[PDB]
Amino acid sequence: GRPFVEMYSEIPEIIHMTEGRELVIPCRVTSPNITVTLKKFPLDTLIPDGKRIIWDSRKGFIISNATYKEIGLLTCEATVNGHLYKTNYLTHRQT
Amino acid sequence: GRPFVEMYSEIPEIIHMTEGRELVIPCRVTSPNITVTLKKFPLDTLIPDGKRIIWDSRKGFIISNATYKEIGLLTCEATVNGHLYKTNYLTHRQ
Amino acid sequence: EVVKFMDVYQRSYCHPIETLVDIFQEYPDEIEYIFKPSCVPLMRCGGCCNDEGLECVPTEESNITMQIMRIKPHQGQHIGEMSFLQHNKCECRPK
Amino acid sequence: HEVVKFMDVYQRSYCHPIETLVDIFQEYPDEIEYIFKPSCVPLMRCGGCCNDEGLECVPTEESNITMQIMRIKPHQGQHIGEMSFLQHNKCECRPKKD
């Protein structure tokens, strides 16, 4: 069913970020063969390349050297058996 | 078939006016018994009352002491033989 | 395609339009928190009267309540339900 | 329900192109000898928020639109002039500079 270990939340979880440091979007799933997509609102997609952006089933998406472009509403998406599931997060730099 | 002496133009004719004085929207028609309505964009129908707003088929609508409410896009409409005809004017101050 | 005169005139004339209003402008005394989002979509009078002596003003008003997140510098984030003013009808009148 | 839900408020306010009523003199500052009718035009322009005081919503992709405007010069007639305006097609939140 829902492949995400954590449950959906209507108000997005806040993630504190610091520019220039690692940023983790923690939408870990129950299996390495589930295909998960990462998007930034309104229309951007962040694709893992194994270097700057890494996907790890047990952790989520790991972005090195976060920048101002990663500040906003990020969403992980997965579809299991025709049903689309998601988890939303709001990244925020400390004042 | 058109009842208005002046012909329809896609670009409204400009009418220079002054608040407090007489404003004439010149949509005169060809015969005295043609029914003509006056509209203000967006939400108004201007009703002749014989005193402040007067209809004269040989001249147009004559408005005594036009107010800021008359500054805008005004349209005369008439339906003759099932066809709706319109003439547009745009009033402009100084 | 060139927009015809009558269409430009009708679409620009004084009327209620969706405007993105900054929350600080509406609540100038809420200075202890950072709001997310920092602005909200509201119907407000806008457009032109095509006469320098006239101005586009509201003639009927109402309220709308929206869920906003408030973050107190270093001390947590909470959802709040804030009320905002909208303009239902607009007219051109003397400055 | 009686309140606009957070996700809706956020998605509807975030930096994006929106119809904006712009004064023609702001776009054609060198043509103040005329009075234009209408005096303002509807244009897609970047608007909304970036939700971070150090960022601003700016255009990253633009194009042009042409519209018929009535141009009035005191005691010269008035003529229709097609005038072009800049429209924003895509926006982004970038750091503010000084």
From Swiss-Prot, chain A:
Disulphide connectivity of cysteines: 27-76
Domain Ig-like C2-type: 20-83
Modification note: N-glycosylated. Ubiquitinated after VEGFA-mediated autophosphorylation, leading to proteolytic degradation.
Domain of life: Eukaryota
Induction: Up-regulated in coculture of VSMC/endothelial cell (EC) or by direct exposure to VEGF of VSMC monoculture. Up-regulated from the second trimester of pregnancy to the term and in the placenta of women with preeclampsia (PE). Up-regulated in monocytes exposed to bacterial lipopolysaccharide (LPS).
Family that this chain belongs to: Belongs to the protein kinase superfamily. Tyr protein kinase family. CSF-1/PDGF receptor subfamily.
Subunit-level organization: Interacts with VEGFA, VEGFB and PGF. Monomer in the absence of bound VEGFA, VEGFB or PGF. Homodimer in the presence of bound VEGFA, VEGFB and PGF. Can also form a heterodimer with KDR. Interacts (when tyrosine phosphorylated) with CBL, CRK, GRB2, NCK1, PIK3R1, PLCG, PSEN1 and PTPN11. Probably also interacts with PTPRB. Interacts with RACK1. Identified in a complex with CBL and CD2AP.
Disease: Can contribute to cancer cell survival, proliferation, migration, and invasion, and tumor angiogenesis and metastasis. May contribute to cancer pathogenesis by promoting inflammatory responses and recruitment of tumor-infiltrating macrophages.
Role noted for this protein: Tyrosine-protein kinase that acts as a cell-surface receptor for VEGFA, VEGFB and PGF, and plays an essential role in the development of embryonic vasculature, the regulation of angiogenesis, cell survival, cell migration, macrophage function, chemotaxis, and cancer cell invasion. Acts as a positive regulator of postnatal retinal hyaloid vessel regression. May play an essential role as a negative regulator of embryonic angiogenesis by inhibiting excessive proliferation of endothelial cells. Can promote endothelial cell proliferation, survival and angiogenesis in adulthood.
Protein name stated in the entry: Vascular endothelial growth factor receptor 1
Source organism of the structure: Homo sapiens (Human)
High-level lineage: Eukaryota, Metazoa, Chordata, Craniata, Vertebrata
From Swiss-Prot, chain D:
Induction: By hypoxia. Regulated by growth factors, cytokines, gonadotropins, nitric oxide, hypoglycemia and oncogenic mutations.
Record's protein name: Vascular endothelial growth factor A, long form
Lineage: Eukaryota, Metazoa, Chordata, Craniata, Vertebrata
Residues of the full protein shown: 218 to 315 of 395
Pathological association: Microvascular complications of diabetes 1: Pathological conditions that develop in numerous tissues and organs as a consequence of diabetes mellitus. They include diabetic retinopathy, diabetic nephropathy leading to end-stage renal disease, and diabetic neuropathy. Diabetic retinopathy remains the major cause of new-onset blindness among diabetic adults. It is characterized by vascular permeability and increased tissue ischemia and angiogenesis.
Provenance organism: Homo sapiens (Human)
Family per similarity comment: Belongs to the PDGF/VEGF growth factor family.
Disulfide bonds, paired cysteine numbers: 15-57, 46-91, 50-93
Gene that produces this protein: VEGFA
Residues with attached carbohydrate: 64
Tissues in which the protein is found: Higher expression in pituitary tumors than the pituitary gland.
